[PDB]
Each structure stands twice: as structure tokens, then as C-alpha cells.
């Protein structure tokens, strides 16, 4: 029971009681007492990153992989905390938690100019639900107790706890048997709110549900699908809701937006007369101008956060609720409406949505050499199973991937959708693998994203954390090249050079095979479209054999303009469209997934 | 003269008038108008980094290389700004400027949740002299005008300017011929202050001058040396003042502190009866406990910043002044004192200091296999000329380097002494090379520091920026291993693994030769001490031939405890000491440098 | 000559050298050492206000009356500083200085919920050129030295100096004869600009 221990020893018991089994980090002198307590305690597995930013994005990937996870990022004082700000921003932006823990100078030296001492509390305040320097050893367990409440309650977000060295080593009395986690706060919609929403949905003649990341955050994907099935209402996931209904479900109507969207999704949204928003937030890249998005449509919005409702557009209804609590009541009310005979038949509207989904396509089956990126995504759909879990960040690589890959379960699209920090992909993929060693993790990066935190591949090598990384290499910051076309320039976006050690990369610059191999991983380079599928098969074998990351680099044509625009009705199609399966053979209408 | 132009076009004229010729950065959609103006203007050379943190440390290295330089770091909105915080902290901590410029969401969308939009103003406020989102196009030139005043005035520090997209493209009227930089504010010591300081120095019987980074910041190294020569007072540079008097000067008495210090330096400081501090700040790693540092000594402190004086200890005098203004007056007063016959002879004290410097040494000439790191620094002193410019960050690599390398001019030790962010070394070295293509740049890293931002080697390859990188590889976070000895543990600090592609690294993990070569550079691995010198000679040839970075990796013994302690009188010597040149042959007393 | 004295005694010499002769205030337990030093030094005339906001606006009027004047407003910890915010805003907004000085809890107790202790540094930062809690006794003269530079230089504005009780009473070595005010920073137009304007 009660015993004297260091405050960091009490912290290890609190982390255990809060479900922590894993931590990613980089030790240093100011956080050694915490590492010492973690060693003494056992049962937190620590993964040593090769950049503090890598540890912080591994924590994000760990959080995102499985409902209830909270990835932990550990670091020393000074520059370690400033290397975590980008991940705190990314987690805050997507409403997900990570717990960052930093060492700090001793309490009495906080305003001297101690070596590597920085006011991380002030720096991290704008990108966290709480950032606190702990000022008493006895408060260490209580600050952690509050941190877990905040990371799980309301709109989730990250916390940073900063630990002065003397506060860590100071002796307190603590009884782990008496520690209890705080209750989680989640508001819930009343029956009066939900009956009104269902009445409005029954009155609409061409409704769609927009299912956002809040549905996945609430672990409510099955309920979201059940509610759509009972009401026969087509579903448009946001990028952050993608996966909460399977892509081959008859009611999955595609995605909507300016970039990561389908031609059928935008066409269905523009044809609809109501948007029933559940756990979304009507993001600018999803809506375009709100005036066009809302034109002729009633808008319902269910959100756990009151100040998200009406922030970018005014809903017709507006309900504060956790998405699971709300969907539980929505299913119950829809079932009462079904027994009463009050749910309208929607065969015509569902048929119109399905015809758009069958005809408004984009070509992927390109035989071109050098390779066209859209062909890579076709081969990925064929090579990987229905249970594949994609991890990606930003770029033409990621945008075309969201346009052309397919996903069939929640938390199988892992993507920092609001912040998009380059270098996220490798560490995030490692964090997903650490959360679930049985997950079939496949990452997608362009060359520039792959280079930012390329050294993290050695983390997968040292710890034998296997996954497949698809690397689509155009020797370009391709998205920035495309956005520069409006300035009639192509400027500071090229990465090519004649590699003095590798004439075989043909002026593409970095030799990613040699780099990945030096970092202890396996790698395959593909120049021809027909060699992609065999490369994915060899990569699976190399993964099983060596249990390390395997990089499949596809050499792309330098310049491909991916479809995008400034409004839902203005997306330009630069590359070939398709209206037939032969040009787009991995649409779920045409292909059975696993 | 007067003409209508975009506010970013006016910004290009302001940067030109402020002396900017170089920028390091990563473009993105929100900062494209600025890149468009930079292309149209010409005459800023842009270097494309492969991590935004790399661009920001290149800017730091560019600033530090040459008095009057201001390195510029450019990036897009969102995660680009959060990737700059570590460099803003490092520059602030060392009192040097960089100018960070970020794109931002349009003014009217700042409080929506725009894609990749973050409150960088609030995040960067604690680590900058000014961080401002510019709210009017006409203010863009005025905010830059104020930024340059702040970066050069008082205690120098960095500025971040955040540019909403609509503010960048908006039309203003601007006349470059009428633009003038603001005057720089620097307080100057009065003759009454300086005569009092010289009186106190004349009264001391065993004085030392502690010459800090403020002397180099003020570009006053020649005056600092002249004042010491006229008064015959031995000089102890801080780590940040190192180089402001040559290491082979008869009055250079070594360095003082807990880690980057000499046995003779600490012994001389403890034997002295006055510390005449010029442009230093009495840092904790320099003093140990202030009670022991100041015991029996009068303390003078000249600093440009009033609130640095008395922050960590109370000086006997205390003078607010720019170091150049102060040293100009100190030389004049010392010359008047010399003509009056009032400067005491100091032959005995100078002789006592020189005898300590001849006898209180540490061994470097080790024949051990695997290699002992102290032998690497001996070979570097022999291989490189007197004009070598070292760039380094933190680790046992850097601490023993400061103990054992020698430097002979100001701004030939380039080191982020207060913040020490890992990954600093490669980008900082590239920034020094960009500032001065004729500089003989040699970097020193341990393996972990080298890995953080290893991809920046491809920046040197793509742009042909040559320098030599000495990489001392112990497959350890060696400094953290050593600091863990107090916790009787060795935990989460090892980087070794059996590399499945390279049995020749013998379980050391990452193959840095293969990685550096894939990134387009040249690399040599050394296992035996006698092969170091020939490797440095081949590296010079490869550099001249290919004009890319050349990495010389020395495989170290896994475990070496570098000398350090908690007080000046308590530094533990784990490895062999020396009292003879044969064991320490590159001390300047024994070796003529170039 | 140099002498041992409390930091608040050294503060009185700095104020005298910077031309202060008048102060408006309301004493309290946390600022008593400053009042004790003011009494011992003499030659600052103190006007006792009947509201801390009254003292703060007296300081504004004193500044505005005569070029070079800097009104000084004194108060205790806690609510006294929050009562000065409206004047700090009013002074900032018109580009004129006042010097506010508040007492504060001892450094060791700044994050305990000590009686009448508030984070005035954070509250006043938006409406001052500087608002600082002084962390070392030796810094009191240097913080005041910088404050007078800021109040006179560039666009003028007010400063709040927040003084922990232990910092006020701690002894320091200070030589009033060696203190000198900092130079004032004022940019000047060149002839090229004035000729263009004419
Ligand atoms: C290059 C690029 C292109 C993109 N293109 C598009 C595009 O075309 N279309 C598109 O839609 N997106 C696109 N995205 C992603 C986009 O930026 C947003 O991240 C995304 O649209 C947000 O989805 P969401 O509305 O579900 O919001 P989320 O960020 O997932 O958050 C929605 C809401 O969930 C709420 N919430 C949290 N927990 C709960 C809970 N338990 N119960 C209920 N509510 C809860 C939060 O309060 C929040 O308001 C793109 C991203 C990138 C990087
Ligand atoms: C692992 C490690 C070990 C280290 N070990 C030691 C050690 O043993 N000993 C040691 O000394 N350092 C050591 N350092 C470096 C140490 O942390 C400090 O960076 C260093 O001591 C500061 O030197 P300085 O006092 O010259 O301060 P600086 O940071 O260089 O600043 C000194 C002052 O210069 C002033 N100033 C700025 N511009 C001007 C101007 N124009 N005129 C006048 N003043 C001006 C500033 O206001 C500031 O107060 C170590 C660093 C690391 C990473
Ligand atoms: C830290 C950071 N800096 C800048 C950006 C802006 N950005 C978005 S995509 C992109 C280029 C992506 O290049 P690559 O990963 O090669 O992908 P491609 O578009 O070529 O497929 C950049 C610089 C960002 N997201 N994060
Ligand atoms: C971002 C960051 N995280 C952590 C640290 C703490 N730190 C200082 S030295 C060190 C290990 C250095 O290892 P390496 O570069 O291999 O050098 P070695 O000490 O082994 O010579 C670490 C982690 C830091 N300085 N910066
Ligand atoms: C040609 O290569 C060049 C770049 O790389 C894409 C740059 O970023 C910037 C310049 C000026 C340049 O010349
Ligand atoms: C009914 O659901 C659907 C199919 O299954 C029958 C398809 O094959 C193809 C489409 C587009 C579809 O919507
Ligand atoms: C043996 O390798 C290991 C590490 O690498 C040094 C760790 O950081 C942490 C653990 C738990 C471990 O087992
Ligand atoms: C006089 O200066 C000195 C020399 O030159 C004569 C030395 O050789 C060696 C030392 C230690 C020295 O201080
Ligand atoms: Mg990197
Ligand atoms: Mg690319
Ligand atoms: Mg090492």
C-alpha cells in the first residue's frame, strides 16, 4: 500500500493505472530520473527514436491506431520540448491526444539561464489542452490524473507535462492501490434533439450523411453504419471519417472536397438536399465556399464541442453530443420510426448516387514509362488485402492516394489531415505497428516527405518493426510545383541532381535504396508499371524474412497534375477521366476486396 | 521610384537594402507569393532544405559565420512555423539573430480552422525578440524594417514574421530609393565606468579576463586581444568567446567550466583574485556553484543587456555596454595608464598560468583499437590548418572536442552552446559554407546527432556545398550513458544492431558510409588510429574533386567517460591525464599551428 | 561609494538619479519595505490616494503635465495590481509612460496560492512596454534602469515592476555614485527624407 517513493515512481504507477504500456522517446540528463523509474517499474516498453520529432509522431500514430490508446512521447529539457511542438499541433488539430513528458531544470533555477532550460509551458500552451510545469513532487500524480481526464474528455487533445529535475527525484508518499482514474466527461444528445434530427432527415428527399473523424474518435463506426442502413441514407465520410463505413458498402457514396475527393462524391453532395453531419466540422478543404456547399440544403451538425457548431457555417439544427451517445439514440429512434412505417423509401436517390459512383471515375491503368502515380494506387489495391491499414501525410502522393485507394474499416486510414507535417509518415507508421503488431501497415510517401525523418527507418531496423513503405519518387515537391502553376513558375521545388555514387537513379538525386539499406532496412526500386505487383510480393516476403521495414520505391514521371480545384463544382481533371472499369479497375463496384 | 507592386515585392527590396543575399527554406502554397517575388527580384540565392528544421539551422550557421550576417529561414504556414521553434530558441539562447518568414492563412480566415493554419505568433513569442502576424500589406516593409533594428540592437535575437496570403499579394505603393534601415541601438560605457574598471584591474594581483560571446557578437576580438596585451592579463574565453584570442597566444589561459574546459583553465581561475568579465554571462556550466566561482575574487561584468548583470551572481562593478564600445575605451585608458607608469608588471602571474598550461594536460595519443575518441581530435589538430572552422553541437563528441581541439580566430568555433539541439551540426555547417565558400569548415558529430537531420547531406550534394564532417561513432548516446552512471543504469541509450545489409559495421547498427553515399556525398570509414590521418587527406582530395560533403566516420570504442564534474574543483579525470607532450602532442605549447 | 543596503534602498537611489521626485500610491504589507526605503531616503513626496485606480491616474496626469515627467504609482500585491490595469491601458494607448510598482509574494511562494498573490506579470503584459516580476535582489536597479530606457525610447509607454517581498529586503552591494541612466533611443529622419517631404 502506502510507501515512500520518488515522484517519478508514483508517475509509473499512475501511467500503469491509466493503461499505458508503451512510450516513444529520447533520454537526456534532465529526464533521467523518469527513465530510471520506468526501468525499475517494467511493463512500459520504450522505443528509442532517432529524432525527438520522430518520437512525437510515433506517439500520434500509436494514439490513432486503436480506440483508447494514448501514445506517450518522452524527452529531455530544452530543445526536446521545442521538437515536440509540431506533433502537439498535429494532434490538437485532429482532436486526438498524445502525452508529452519533458525534463526541466530544477525549480529554483527556472529563471536563471540554466543550460538547455526553456519556457516550454508558454510555447506549448497554444497547441495543447494543458501544458504545465509541475511545481511540487506531490502534484506529479495529480497532474497526470488531470491530464488523462482532459485527453479523453470533450474534444480530445494533447497534454504536455514538464518535470523539474528536483521535482522528479523528491520523495513523496503514494499508494497505488488507492489511485483511480477520473471520470471522462462527454455530453450526450437528448431524445428531443435526436427526434428533431430524425424528423428533418425524414422530410429530406435526397439526404446524405457526412461522417467525420468524431465518429471514429467516439469508436462509433458500427453504429454509424447501422444508422445509415436503417435509414437507407448514403454516407460521405470526411477524410478523417474515412473507413467508418466500408468502401464497398452499397451506401458509401465517396468523399467530398477540393482535393481528397471523388468526382461522384462531389456530384452527389451537390445533388443532395440535406447534409446530416455527424462528428465532422465542415473543413475548408471539404466545403470550398460555404455558400455553395450549403446552397439548397438543410444542414444538421452533431459535435462534441459547442464552439465547433456555427464556426464556419450556420447549421439548421446544431446538437452538442458525443457521436457514440448520439448514434445510439439515432439508431433507437430510427427503429421506432421503422416500426411506425415513417421512414421513406430511398431506392431512387440511392440508385442515382450509385450511378454517379459507377460512371464518374478517373483513369488508373496506365502502362506509361516512366510510371504514372495513379497506376501505383491501382496496384496497391490489388496487392494488399481488405485489412490493409494505410499511413500517409501530404503531397500529390497522399492526395491521389486518397482519391484512388480503398479502405474497409475504421482506423485503417491514418493521416494527419489538418496539420500535414512533412516527415510524419515513417514515425506514425512505426507507432501504429507498435500499437498493433498484427496490423497490415502500408505507408505512402512522396520523396520529400520520406526524406524529412528518413533516419527513423533505423528505429524499425533496431527494434524489428516491420511494415511496407510505398515511396513514389518524382524528384519534386510535386504539390508545390502544381500550386506554383498559378504563378507561372517552377521554382525551388526540384530535388534532382546527378548522384555521384549512383548513375542508375538517372539524375533523380537521392538513392533511396542505398539510404534505406544503410539504415538497416530492405528496399526495392521499380521503373516499369508491370514490375510494381511483383515488387509488392517480394516486399511481403522480405518483411516476413527479416522483420524490418521494406521500402518499395517507384520512379515516377517528374510531372503529374493531380485533380483538384477551388470549389466542389470546379475541380479540374488534368489527367484522363474514366467512365469504364477497364480504365479504373479497382473501384469497389468492379472489384471484390479480399 | 514610386511604383505599385505586391507587398512581397516591396519585401524583396527591403531585404536587399538590409544586406540579405541568401535564404534557406522550404516553399509551400501559403508562401508561394513570397517565392514568386524572390524569383522576380533575383539576387537572393535560395537553398532548398530537406527539413524545415534544416533550413532554420542553416540560417543560424549563416548568421554565426561572419559579423553582420543575418540568416533567413523561409517556410509555409502551419507545421513549417512549428518546425522553426527549436532554431528560434537556439538563436535566442545564444543572443544571435535569424529572420524566420512564414506564410499564413488569409486575414479573414485566421480564426476559422483553415487548413494548416496555426497561431505561430503565440507559439514563437517566448523564443523571439518579435513574432508578428502582419495585418496590412503596407506594414510588410515596416515590420521588416523594425525586425532588422531588433535583430541588430541591444542583446541580439531572432524575429519571426508571419505573412497572411492576402497580405502578401495585395498591392501597395513603395519607393525602394526612399527606404532606409533604422539606426542600431547599442549603449556604450562612459569613461567614468571604464576608469573604475581599470583601477580595479590594476589593484588585482592575479587577474584574468573572461571573454564571452558578446566580444564576438560585437566584432571586437582584435580589441579584446589588444587590451589583454597592453595589460598583460591572461584571457579565459567562454565556450562562446572561444577564438577571440588565438589558442597559441601567450596570454590564452585555457577554458573554464564543468565540461568544455581545461584542467589548467579551472586551476588558473581558482588561483586568480579577479575575474574581468567582458561580454560573458557567467553560465552555470561555466561557473559551477557561484559561491565557489566568486570566492576570494572581485568580479567585473560588462554586458550590453542591463538585466544580465546580477542575474546569477552579484558583480563588484557591473557596466552596461556594447563590448566593442567598451573595449575601445578600455584600450584608450590602458594606454594612458601605460604612459603614466601605472600598469603593474605581471610576469610572475603570467608565468604561473603558463606553467599550469604546460603541465595539467589530458592524454590524446592513444594507439587503441577500437579507437579512443581523444586520438581523433589530436589527428584533426595535425591534419587541418590554423584557419580551420569547427562546427559542432552536443555530446561526448563535442565536449571532448572543446577540451582537445584548438582554434585561432573568432567565428572558427560555431557551436549552439546554450540550447544544443541534436541535428544542428550538418545544417549549421552548410550555412557557414553558404556564408563563406572559402571557409575551411570541419564539423564534428556523434552518431546520434548525425542521424537527426542526416538527410541534409543531400542539400550539400544537390548544391555542391563541400565541407568535411568528422563522425565519431560509438553506437551510443554516449553523454546520456555517462550521465546515467549516477543512476547505476545503462538504459535506452544504445543504437547498435546487427545491420542485415552490412556485416562489416560489426553490430554498430546504421551504416553511415552507405547512407552518406545514397544521399550523394562521399564517405570513408576508419577502424584503426593510424588510418585517421590518411583518411583526412583523402577526404580533402575527394572534396576538391567532387565538391560535396565528405564524411569521415571513425569507429570508436563503445564506452569512453569524458572528463567532467559538478564544480571547477571537482572535475573527475576518468581517462589518462598527461603532464608531457608525448601523451598530448597537439597542445599549442608543443606544436606550431600552420 | 558602494555600500550594503536593501534592494529597495538601491531602488530609491535609482529613482532619484532618474529624476523621480513624486509618487502616488496605497501602501500594503507586501510593499512595506519599499515604503520604508522611500521614507529613509526622503525627497520623494508621496501622495496617498483613496483608490489604487486613483493613484494610477494621478501618475498619468503627472506624466502628461510636463515634458520629461514620469508619474510613479505604488501598490501592494494582489488586487492593487489588477486595479492599475486600466491606467496601464490608458497610458499605453496614448503613447505615454507611467511607472507602476507592486509588491508581491516571496519568490518561493509564487505558485502556492499565497494570500493576495496574482500573476500580474501576465495580466499587464498586453498593456505595457514591460511588465516583469524581479527574480533577484541584484536585478532591482537593473530592471529599473531598463524601465526608464523603455519609458523614454521609441514610442513611449508604461512599465510595471513587480517586487517579491524577499527580493525587496535582501541586501545587495550598490554604488549610487556609479549609476548612470541608459541612453534614450530616438530614430531621426535623414535629410533625403525631409527634402522629399518639403
Ligand atoms: C492535402 C490535403 C487535402 C485534403 N483534402 C480534403 C478534401 O478534399 N476533403 C476533405 O473532407 N478533407 C480533406 N483533407 C482533410 C481536411 O483538411 C480535414 O482534416 C478534414 O476534412 C476534417 O474532417 P472532419 O470534418 O471529420 O474533422 P475532424 O478534424 O475529424 O474533427 C471533426 C469534429 O469532431 C469533433 N469530435 C471529437 N471527438 C468527438 C466525439 N467523441 N464525438 C463527436 N464529435 C467529436 C471535434 O470537436 C471536431 O469538431 C485534406 C487534407 C490534406 C492534407
Ligand atoms: C555539453 C556542453 C558543455 C558545455 N560546457 C561548458 C563549460 O564547461 N564552460 C563554459 O564556459 N561553457 C560551456 N558550455 C557552453 C555554455 O552552456 C554557454 O553557452 C556559455 O558558457 C555561454 O558563454 P558566454 O558567458 O560568453 O555567454 P553568451 O551566450 O555568449 O552571452 C553572453 C552575453 O553577451 C551579451 N552580449 C550580446 N551582444 C553583446 C554585445 N554586442 N556587447 C556586449 N555584450 C553582448 C548578452 O547580453 C549575454 O549576456 C557548454 C555547452 C554544452 C552544450
Ligand atoms: C514542414 C512542412 N513544410 C512544408 C510543407 C508544405 N508541403 C506540402 S506538400 C509538399 C511537397 C511534398 O513533396 P513529396 O513528399 O515529394 O510529394 P509529391 O507532392 O511530390 O508527391 C510541401 C513542401 C508541409 N506540409 N510541411
Ligand atoms: C533534441 C535533443 N534531444 C535530446 C538531447 C540530449 N542529448 C544531449 S547529448 C545526447 C546524446 C548524444 O549522442 P551522440 O551524438 O552519438 O554523441 P556521443 O555523446 O555518443 O559522442 C543527447 C540525447 C538534445 N541535446 N537534443
Ligand atoms: C536550380 O536549382 C535551384 C533550386 O533548387 C530547386 C532552388 O531552390 C533555388 C535556386 C536559385 C536554384 O537555382
Ligand atoms: C449496388 O451497389 C453497387 C454494386 O453492386 C451491385 C456495383 O457493382 C457497382 C456500384 C457503383 C454500386 O453502387
Ligand atoms: C535492448 O534494447 C532496448 C532499448 O534500446 C536501447 C530501449 O530504448 C528500451 C528497451 C526496453 C530495450 O529493450
Ligand atoms: C610563453 O608561452 C608558452 C610557450 O612558448 C614559449 C610554450 O612553448 C609552452 C607554454 C605552456 C607557454 O605558455
Ligand atoms: Mg531527419
Ligand atoms: Mg515528390
Ligand atoms: Mg554516439
DSSP string, B378-409: HHHHHHS-TTEEEEE-SSHHHHHHHHH----S
Q: Which of A269, A277, A323 is nearest to A296 (CA)?
A: A269
CB B366 within 8 A of CB B406: no
Q: Is B531 exposed, middle or buried (0-12, 13-18, 19+ CB in 10 A)?
A: middle
Integer Cα distance of A211 and A244 in angstroms: 8
Residue of chain A nearest B50, judged by CA positions? A452
* Alpha-helix runs per DSSP H in B126-204: 140-152, 165-169, 191-203
Integer Cα distance of B394 and B482 in angstroms: 14
Chain B positions in Cβ-Cβ contact with residue C143 (cut-off 8 Å): 306-307
| Contact across the interface for B35 and A492, Cβ inside 8 Å | yes
CA-closest residue to ligand 1 atom 8: A257
The three grid cell numbers given for residue B180, joined into one nine-digit string: 532606409
Torsion angles phi and psi, residue A371, rounded to 5: -65, 145
Length of chain A equals 594
The three grid cell numbers given for residue C113, joined into one nine-digit string: 496560492
Instruction: Give the position of cell 439508431.
Output: A331
Integer Cα distance of C165 and C32 in angstroms: 9
| Contact across the interface for B51 and A281, Cβ inside 8 Å | no
CA-closest residue to ligand 8 atom 8: B589
Integer Cα distance of A534 and A552 in angstroms: 11
| Contact across the interface for B452 and A50, Cβ inside 8 Å | yes
Cited resolution, angstroms: 2.0
Determine how many CB atoms are found less than 10 A away from the CB of residue C40. Answer: 12
CA distances from A556 to A26, A258, A474, A532, A584 (A): 36, 24, 5, 12, 19
Chain B positions in Cβ-Cβ contact with residue C139 (cut-off 8 Å): 307, 310-311
Helix A7-17 vs helix A32-41: crossing angle, to nearest 10: 50
Integer Cα distance of A245 and A356 in angstroms: 19
Determine how many CB atoms are found less than 10 A away from the CB of residue B345. Answer: 8
Torsion angles phi and psi, residue A104, rounded to 5: -150, 160
- Touching C (3+ Cβ pairs <8 A), the chains are B
Q: How close does chain A come to B187, measured CA to CA in Å?
A: 23
| Contact across the interface for C142 and B310, Cβ inside 8 Å | yes
End-to-end Cα, chain C, rounded Å: 53
Integer Cα distance of C37 and B590 in angstroms: 59
Integer Cα distance of A161 and A151 in angstroms: 12
Query: Catalytic pick from B230, B350, B480, B493?
Result: B480
Return the bridge partners of B161, or none: B101, B132
Sheet holding B22-25, edge to edge: B45-48, B22-25, B71-75, B98-104, B159-164, B130-133
Integer Cα distance of B422 and B501 in angstroms: 26
The three grid cell numbers given for residue A477, joined into one nine-digit string: 515537391
CA-closest residue to ligand 6 atom 6: A589
Return the bridge partners of B277, or none: B210, B301
Element (H, E) at B24: strand B22-25
**Chain A to chain B Cβ contacts (< 8 Å):** 288
CB B566 within 8 A of CB B353: no
Q: How close does chain B come to C192, measured CA to CA in Å?
A: 8
Integer Cα distance of B317 and B487 in angstroms: 42
- Give A534's contacts (C-beta < 8 A, 6+ positions apart): none
Integer Cα distance of B564 and C153 in angstroms: 45
Integer Cα distance of B431 and B179 in angstroms: 28
Q: Which of C120, C128, C99 is nearest to C164 (CA)?
A: C120
Q: Strand (E) positions, B387-481?
A: 388-392, 413-415, 440-446, 468-473
Integer Cα distance of B471 and B493 in angstroms: 18
> DSSP per residue over A418-442, as a string?
TT--TT-HHHHHHHHHHH-TTSEEE
Q: Which of A463, A502, A515 to mutate to test the interface with B (most CBs of B within 10 A)?
A: A515
Determine how many CB atoms are found less than 10 A away from the CB of residue A355. Answer: 11
| Contact across the interface for C178 and B193, Cβ inside 8 Å | yes
| Contact across the interface for C145 and B306, Cβ inside 8 Å | yes
Would residue B480 show up in a list of annotated catalytic residues for this protein?
yes
Q: Supply the residues of A annotated as catalytic.
A: 26, 52, 422, 477, 480
Integer Cα distance of A211 and A301 in angstroms: 10
Determine how many CB atoms are found less than 10 A away from the CB of residue C166. Answer: 16
Q: Which of B66, B65, B85 is nearest to B75 (CA)?
A: B85
The pairing of beta strand B361-362 with beta strand B577-578: antiparallel
Q: Is B486 exposed, middle or buried (0-12, 13-18, 19+ CB in 10 A)?
A: exposed
Would residue B52 show up in a list of annotated catalytic residues for this protein?
yes
Residue A160's SS3 state is strand
Q: How close does chain B come to A373, measured CA to CA in Å?
A: 21
Integer Cα distance of A230 and A338 in angstroms: 8
Q: Is C60 exposed, middle or buried (0-12, 13-18, 19+ CB in 10 A)?
A: buried
Integer Cα distance of B318 and B193 in angstroms: 9
- Give B373's contacts (C-beta < 8 A, 6+ positions apart): B396, B397, B400, B472, B474, B554, B556, B560, B562
Length of chain B equals 594
Instruction: Give the position of cell 488508373.
Output: A364
Structural method: X-ray
Radius of gyration of chain A (CA): 25
The three grid cell numbers given for residue B545, joined into one nine-digit string: 574533386
Torsion angles phi and psi, residue A445, rounded to 5: -135, 150
> What count of Cα atoms within 13 Å lies in the side-chain half-sphere of residue C33?
24
CB B30 within 8 A of CB B165: yes
Chain B residues within 8 angstroms (CB to CB) of chain C: 153, 178, 180, 182-183, 185, 187-188, 190, 192-193, 196, 306-307, 309-311, 314, 316-318, 320
- Touching A (3+ Cβ pairs <8 A), the chains are B
CB A62 within 8 A of CB A69: yes
> What count of Cα atoms within 13 Å lies in the side-chain half-sphere of residue B459?
32
Which ligand neighbours the alpha carbon of B234 most closely? 8
**Closest approach atom of ligand 1 to CA A417:** 19
**DSSP secondary structure letter of residue B324:** H
The three grid cell numbers given for residue A292, joined into one nine-digit string: 455553395
Amino acid at each position: 500500500g502506502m510507501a515512500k517513493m520518488r515522484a517519478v515512481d508514483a508517475a509509473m504507477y499512475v501511467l500503469e493505472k491509466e493503461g499505458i504500456t508503451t512510450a516513444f522517446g529520447v533520454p537526456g540528463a534532465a529526464i533521467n530520473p523518469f527513465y530510471s523509474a520506468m526501468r525499475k517499474h517494467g511493463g512500459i516498453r520504450h522505443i528509442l527514436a532517432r529524432h525527438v520529432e520522430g518520437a512525437s509522431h510515433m506517439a500520434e500514430g500509436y494514439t490513432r491506431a486503436t480506440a483508447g490508446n494514448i501514445g506517450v512521447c518522452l524527452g529531455t529539457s530544452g530543445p526536446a520540448g521545442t521538437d515536440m511542438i509540431t506533433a502537439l499541433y498535429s494532434a490538437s488539430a485532429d482532436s486526438i491526444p498524445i502525452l508529452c513528458i519533458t525534463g526541466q531544470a530544477p525549480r529554483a533555477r527556472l529563471h536563471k539561464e540554466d543550460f538547455q532550460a526553456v519556457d516550454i509551458e508558454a510555447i506549448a500552451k497554444p497547441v495543447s489542452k494543458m501544458a504545465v510545469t509541475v511545481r511540487e513532487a506531490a502534484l506529479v500524480p495529480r497532474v497526470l490524473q488531470q491530464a488523462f481526464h482532459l485527453m479523453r474528455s470533450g474534444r480530445p487533445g494533447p497534454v504536455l507535462v514538464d518535470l523539474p529535475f528536483d521535482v522528479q527525484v523528491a520523495e513523496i508518499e503514494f499508494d497505488p492501490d488507492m489511485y483511480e482514474p477520473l471520470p471522462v466527461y462527454k455530453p450526450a444528445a437528448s431524445r428531443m434533439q435526436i427526434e428533431k434530427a430524425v424528423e428533418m432527415l425524414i422530410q429530406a428527399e435526397r439526404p446524405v450523411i457526412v461522417a467525420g473523424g468524431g465518429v471514429i474518435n467516439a469508436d462509433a463506426a458500427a453504429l454509424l453504419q447501422q444508422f445509415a442502413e436503417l435509414t437507407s441514407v448514403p454516407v460521405i465520410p470526411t477524410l478523417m471519417g474515412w473507413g467508418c463505413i466500408p468502401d464497398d458498402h452499397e451506401l458509401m457514396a465517396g468523399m467530398v472536397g477540393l482535393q481528397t475527393a471523388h468526382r461522384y462524391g462531389n456530384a452527389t453532395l451537390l445533388a443532395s438536399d440535406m447534409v446530416f453531419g455527424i462528428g465532422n466540422r465542415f473543413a475548408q478543404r471539404h466545403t470550398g465556399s460555404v455558400e455553395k456547399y450549403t446552397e439548397g440544403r438543410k444542414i444538421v451538425h452533431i459535435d462534441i464541442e459547442p464552439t465547433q457548431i456555427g464556426r464556419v457555417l450556420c447549421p439548421d439544427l446544431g446538437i452538442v453530443s458525443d457521436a457514440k451517445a448520439a448514434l445510439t439514440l439515432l439508431v433507437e429512434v430510427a427503429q421506432e420510426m421503422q416500426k411506425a412505417g415513417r421512414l421513406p423509401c430511398r431506392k431512387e436517390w440511392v440508385a442515382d448516387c450509385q450511378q454517379r459512383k459507377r460512371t464518374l471515375l478517373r483513369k488508373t491503368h496506365f502502362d506509361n514509362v516512366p510510371v504514372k502515380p495513379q497506376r501505383v494506387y491501382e496496384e496497391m489495391n490489388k496487392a494488399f488485402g481488405r485489412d490493409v491499414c494505410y499511413v500517409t501525410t501530404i503531397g500529390l502522393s497522399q492526395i491521389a492516394a486518397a482519391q484512388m485507394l480503398h479502405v474497409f474499416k475504421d482506423r485503417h486510414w491514418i493521416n494527419c489531415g489538418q496539420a500535414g507535417p512533412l516527415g510524419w509518415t515513417i514515425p506514425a507508421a512505426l507507432g501504429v505497428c507498435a500499437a498493433d503488431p498484427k496490423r497490415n501497415v502500408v505507408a505512402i510517401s512522396g520523396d520529400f516527405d520520406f526524406q524529412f525523418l528518413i533516419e527513423e527507418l533505423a528505429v524499425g531496423a533496431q527494434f524489428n518493426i516491420p511494415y511496407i513503405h510505398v515511396l513514389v519518387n518524382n524528384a519534386y515537391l510535386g504539390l508545390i510545383r502544381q500550386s506554383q502553376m498559378a504563378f507561372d513558375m517552377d521554382y525551388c521545388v526540384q530535388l534532382a541532381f546527378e548522384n555521384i555514387n549512383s548513375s542508375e537513379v538517372n539524375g533523380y538525386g537521392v538513392d533511396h535504396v542505398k539510404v534505406a539499406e544503410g539504415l538497416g532496412c530492405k528496399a526495392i526500386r521499380v521503373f516499369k508499371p508491370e514490375d510494381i505487383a511483383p515488387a509488392f510480393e517480394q516486399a511481403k516476403a522480405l518483411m516476413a524474412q527479416y522483420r524490418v521495414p521494406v521500402v518499395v520505391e517507384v520512379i515516377l514521371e517528374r510531372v503529374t497534375n493531380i485533380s483538384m480545384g477551388s470549389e466542389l463544382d470546379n475541380v479540374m481533371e488534368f489527367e484522363d477521366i474514366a467512365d469504364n472499369a477497364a480504365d479504373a479497375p479497382t473501384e469497389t463496384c468492379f472489384m471484390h476486396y479480399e
